[PDB]
Structure 1
Amino acid sequence: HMAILHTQINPRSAEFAANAATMLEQVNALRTLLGRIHEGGGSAAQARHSARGKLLVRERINRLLDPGSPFLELSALAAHEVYGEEVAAAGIVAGIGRVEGVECMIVGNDATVKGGTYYPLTVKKHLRAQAIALENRLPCIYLVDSGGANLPRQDEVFPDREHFGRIFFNQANMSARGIPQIAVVMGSCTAGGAYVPAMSDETVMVREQATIFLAGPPLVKAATGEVVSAEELGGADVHCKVSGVADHYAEDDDHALAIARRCVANLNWRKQGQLQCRAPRAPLYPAEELYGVIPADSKQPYDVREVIARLVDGSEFDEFKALFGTTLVCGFAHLHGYPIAILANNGILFAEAAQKGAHFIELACQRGIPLLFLQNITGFMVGQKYEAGGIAKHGAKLVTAVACARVPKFTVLIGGSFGAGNYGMCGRAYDPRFLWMWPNARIGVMGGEQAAGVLAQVKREQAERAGQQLGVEEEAKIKAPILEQYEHQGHPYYSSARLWDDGVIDPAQTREVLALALSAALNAPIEPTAFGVFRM
Structure 2
Amino acid sequence: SHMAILHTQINPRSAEFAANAATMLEQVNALRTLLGRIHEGGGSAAQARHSARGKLLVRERINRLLDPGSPFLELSALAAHEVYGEEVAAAGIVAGIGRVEGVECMIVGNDATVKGGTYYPLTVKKHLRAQAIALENRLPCIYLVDSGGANLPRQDEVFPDREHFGRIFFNQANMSARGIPQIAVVMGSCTAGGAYVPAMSDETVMVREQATIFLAGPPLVKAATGEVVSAEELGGADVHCKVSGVADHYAEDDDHALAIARRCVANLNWRKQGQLQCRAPRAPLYPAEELYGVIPADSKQPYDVREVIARLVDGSEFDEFKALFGTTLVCGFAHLHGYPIAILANNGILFAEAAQKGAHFIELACQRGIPLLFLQNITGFMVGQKYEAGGIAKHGAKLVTAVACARVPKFTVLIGGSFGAGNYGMCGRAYDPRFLWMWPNARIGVMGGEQAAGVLAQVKREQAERAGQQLGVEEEAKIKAPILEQYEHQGHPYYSSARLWDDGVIDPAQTREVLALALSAALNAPIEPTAFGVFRM
TM-score using structure 1 length: 0.97
Q: Deviations over 1:3-40 (max 9, x none)?
A: 11111111111211221122122111100000000111
What corresponds to 1:235 in structure 2? 236
**Partners in 2 of 1:119 and 1:219 — Cα distance?**
20
More displaced 10-residue stretch of structure 1: 302-311 or 217-226: 217-226
State the SS of the aligned residue for 1:130: helix
Q: Deviations over 1:32-61 (max 9, x none)?
A: 000000111111111011011011011000
**Partners in 1 of 2:397 and 2:386 — Cα distance?**
17
Structure 2 vs 1, CA of residues 458 and 15 (structure 1 numbering), >3 Å: closer, same or farther?
farther
State the SS of the aligned residue for 1:223: coil
Q: CA deviation at 1:449?
A: 2.4
Q: Deviations over 1:440-488 (max 9, x none)?
A: 1111111112112224545676899999998989876543211111111
1:196 and 2:190 correspond: no
Indicate conservation of the 8 Å contact 2:83/2:498, yes or no.
Answer: yes
**Partners in 2 of 1:323 and 1:218 — Cα distance?**
69
Q: Deviations over 1:293-329 (max 9, x none)?
A: 1111111111000100111111110000010010000
What corresponds to 1:53 in structure 2? 54
**Partners in 2 of 1:355 and 1:348 — Cα distance?**
14
Q: CA deviation at 1:212?
A: 0.3
**Partners in 2 of 1:23 and 1:478 — Cα distance?**
33
Structure 2 vs 1, CA of residues 465 and 273 (structure 1 numbering), >3 Å: closer, same or farther?
closer
State the SS of the aligned residue for 1:397: helix
Which has the larger share of helix?
A: 1
Q: Deviations over 1:180-238 (max 9, x none)?
A: 00000000111121110000000000000000001111222121221110001111100
More displaced 10-residue stretch of structure 1: 362-371 or 42-51: 42-51
Once the two structures are superposed, the pairs formed by residues 23-422 of structure 1 within 5 Å of their partners are 23-422=24-423
**Partners in 2 of 1:98 and 1:341 — Cα distance?**
26
More displaced 10-residue stretch of structure 1: 138-147 or 468-477: 468-477
**Partners in 2 of 1:243 and 1:467 — Cα distance?**
78
Q: CA deviation at 1:115?
A: 0.9
Q: Deviations over 1:264-300 (max 9, x none)?
A: 0000000001000111111111111111111111111
Structure 2 vs 1, CA of residues 466 and 409 (structure 1 numbering), >3 Å: closer, same or farther?
closer
Determine what percentage of the aligned residue pairs are the same residue: 100
More displaced 10-residue stretch of structure 1: 290-299 or 423-432: 290-299
Indicate conservation of the 8 Å contact 2:284/2:311, yes or no.
Answer: yes
Structure 2 vs 1, CA of residues 195 and 464 (structure 1 numbering), >3 Å: closer, same or farther?
closer
Q: Deviations over 1:376-434 (max 9, x none)?
A: 01111111111111111100110000000000000001011011111110001100000
Structure 2 vs 1, CA of residues 474 and 7 (structure 1 numbering), >3 Å: closer, same or farther?
farther
Structure 2 regions of 5+ residues with no counterpart?
none
State the SS of the aligned residue for 1:125: helix
The structure 1 segments of at least 4 consecutive aligned residues displaced by more than 2 Å after TM superposition are 452-480
TM-score using structure 2 length: 0.97
**Partners in 2 of 1:164 and 1:464 — Cα distance?**
49
**Partners in 1 of 2:146 and 2:398 — Cα distance?**
47
**Partners in 1 of 2:200 and 2:227 — Cα distance?**
27
More displaced 10-residue stretch of structure 1: 481-490 or 396-405: 481-490
Number of residues of Structure 1 aligned to a counterpart in Structure 2? 536
RMSD: 1.7
**Partners in 2 of 1:309 and 1:295 — Cα distance?**
17
State the SS of the aligned residue for 1:212: strand
Q: Deviations over 1:152-183 (max 9, x none)?
A: 11010000101011000111000001100000
Indicate conservation of the 8 Å contact 2:150/2:193, yes or no.
Answer: no
Structure 1 regions of 5+ residues with no counterpart?
none
More displaced 10-residue stretch of structure 1: 208-217 or 13-22: 13-22
State the SS of the aligned residue for 1:507: coil
Structure 2 vs 1, CA of residues 479 and 146 (structure 1 numbering), >3 Å: closer, same or farther?
same
More displaced 10-residue stretch of structure 1: 11-20 or 105-114: 11-20
